[PDB]
């Protein structure tokens, strides 16, 4: 398989589609649209499905700029994929453009990295420069977190009583044999100390050589938050929640202000487990109690609820049916 028939299964196990099926659903939803509206207007003869939709994938180059690429699906090296789709619809027989953005739930599940944030920002900037709608399909698990794995594997504990660890410990340290081969990478800051006659490097700040797990993800997240706040005021913004959304993934959705939510999904800021740990008892049993449709649809964060992703893409096209092709 090696891709494309192993990621689809993982996506299906979570109650959502694979990301690279978003275009096919899109085409099929357009077909339904041409039929559904046929009772409302004297529409011209529809186009063939092969001529109903043409689209190009937006990928990042080595500098941070977009490239309109034609490539086989599944070639994504990051957890975000975006497209420019041109199509014909009943209200727009010749020309209608959108920028579609989506998370890949199967790449390092959900979570936003610096490159995902950069692609989001560039695709949104393209949408604003063109003045065309932005569509965001959210299936994420928040920002990206991580530890410095080498240090986690090569640290030692300075105990108060090495024969009884319940008398506590004083600090965490590296030995020189292991310090000398990591500190050159600016992965860790340590202070030399002498303890029991031994030279130890007590760790004071851990940085990590891996990129995409540190505070740089906050800088990215807030950055794209601003973009969404801008896009609402320039272009049309619509959001579809297929699996779940955590943290920034929910604010982006909220900053779109036009939310379609699939059944058995949840928009949360904190999970049930963390709340049950703070409160001291099993208060909540499911995340759907916290950000489910019984909460989001009745408090007005969610404009519409649907049963599956295909109906969601249909609802997107239905709302787009009422609105101009562009801000101009």
């Amino acid at each position: 398989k090696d891709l494309l028939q192993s990621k689809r299964f993982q996506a299906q196990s979570l109650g959502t589609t694979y990301i690279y099926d978003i275009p096919e659903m899109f085409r099929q939803s357009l077909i339904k649209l041409w039929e559904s509206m046929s009772t409302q207007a004297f529409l011209p003869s529809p186009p063939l499905p092969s001529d109903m939709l043409t689209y190009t994938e937006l990928v990042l180059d080595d500098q941070g700029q977009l490239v309109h690429m034609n490539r086989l699906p599944g070639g994504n090296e990051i957890g975000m994929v975006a497209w420019k789709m041109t199509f014909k619809s009943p209200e727009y027989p010749e020309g209608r453009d959108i920028i579609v953005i989506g998370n890949d739930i199967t790449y390092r599940i959900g979570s936003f990295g610096p490159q995902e944030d950069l692609l989001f920002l560039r695709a949104s900037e393209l949408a604003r420069a063109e003045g065309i709608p932005r569509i965001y399909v959210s299936a994420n698990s928040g920002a990206r977190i991580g530890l410095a794995e080498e240090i986690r594997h090569m640290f030692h504990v300075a105990w108060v009583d090495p024969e009884d660890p319940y008398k506590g410990y004083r600090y965490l340290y590296l030995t020189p044999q292991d310090y000398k081969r990591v500190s050159a990478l600016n992965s860790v800051h340590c202070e030399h100390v002498e303890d029991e006659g031994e030279s130890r490097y007590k760790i004071t700040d851990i940085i990590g050589k891996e990129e995409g797990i540190g505070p740089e993800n906050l800088r990215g997240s807030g950055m794209i938050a601003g973009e969404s706040s801008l896009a609402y005021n320039e272009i049309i913004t619509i959001s579809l929640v297929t699996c779940r959304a955590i943290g920034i993934g929910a604010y982006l959705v909220r900053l779109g202000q036009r939310t379609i939510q699939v059944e058995n999904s949840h928009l949360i800021l904190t999970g049930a487990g963390a709340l049950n740990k703070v409160l001291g008892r099993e208060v909540y049993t499911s995340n759907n109690q916290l950000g489910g449709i019984q909460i989001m649809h009745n408090n007005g964060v969610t404009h519409c609820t649907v049963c599956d992703d295909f109906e969601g893409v249909f609802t997107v096209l239905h709302w787009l049916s009422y609105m101009p092709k562009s801000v101009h």
């Binding site: 928040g142 410990y169 851990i206 938050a225 800021l269 904190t270």
Partner: protein
Amino acid sequence: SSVPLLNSKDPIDRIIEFVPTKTPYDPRWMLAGRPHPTQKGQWLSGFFDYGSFSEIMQPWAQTVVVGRARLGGIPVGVVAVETRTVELSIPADPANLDSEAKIIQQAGQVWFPDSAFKTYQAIKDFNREGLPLMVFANWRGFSGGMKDMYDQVLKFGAYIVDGLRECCQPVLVYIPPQAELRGGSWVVIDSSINPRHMEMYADRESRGSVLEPEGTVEIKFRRKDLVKTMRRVDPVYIHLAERLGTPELSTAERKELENKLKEREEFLIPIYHQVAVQFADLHDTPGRMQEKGVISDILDWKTSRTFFYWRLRRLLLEDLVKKKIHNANPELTDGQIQAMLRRWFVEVEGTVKAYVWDNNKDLAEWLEKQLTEEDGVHSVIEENIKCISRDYVLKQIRSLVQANPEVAMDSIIHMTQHISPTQRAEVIRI
């Protein structure tokens, strides 16, 4: 007009005496100060000029504090965060005979819908007044429980972003000592929302990350990773595990060793859990934020006023000259204007003095001299601004006619009615 300045009685070269602690504290104690706990008089200084802090909307949304104050005679708007637990009393409606008054417990360092709404309102009001904004950020994130998601916390979290993106004055975010910013609280006040005006600073005793250490441990340090760590640390576990993996011992010995290993694995969990939490905390430090470039600098609390005075003043003075530049050529962007000012400074002072830019005091004095001095050295910066203005006007005339040649013969004639004879000779001969 610009924000008014006072010749304050409270110095700029003093230190802040009150130090934020790890235990709960009233945020006003760090803004205005407090009486000495051991004396009958004796005021312990805070951040702002004594007597200057003035609150608004006190009994509403008590988890966040907002007000106005002065720094060195410079008026500022102030936002700070309650760390203590507050109790919100909800009254009963007499229209319902079966209604009851309730008390809701609200923990500190947390957004609630009401506290987010208050923060938004304060930001909008202070920006529209024309003031710079000082934010003292100690938010652990948003409430995610059933009630607060039902009570629409996401909406006001988003309104915070919508507010900050539209600020036109300096916005200085500072993370005090023994304070943290976690995740959802970053993405709403990050400096990348409005880079032209927002700047973020951290103390040495501050923290910033996506999740708290415990939440990160709960994901990245499961039971099995704790056991893998025990495998290379605990002498007892190491002895037992090396013995159990030794071939050709016996069946009963292997069974006893395995049971002892299970007992040690479960016994040692609390200590290695605390170790994992410390390991997680070691990557939430401001040195990492400085190396990654998400804060502008790392400040010591005690001298912070002296920093923030001279920074703020400079920015205000820059905001004047940049504005004039923007008036000379409204087509320029902000980076062009910053580089232009850089170049003008180095050109007029000399390259040996080019290092005197990232020095808030010396450059603020220089900018003050160039902007406020008249009938004197005559402000070479002013002449440069005049030249930029002249070039813009000329470019606009040529741009306007080049797009519309059909009016050219009417624009020439009018411009030959207010010129000297020699200029008319130049017009005819050339």
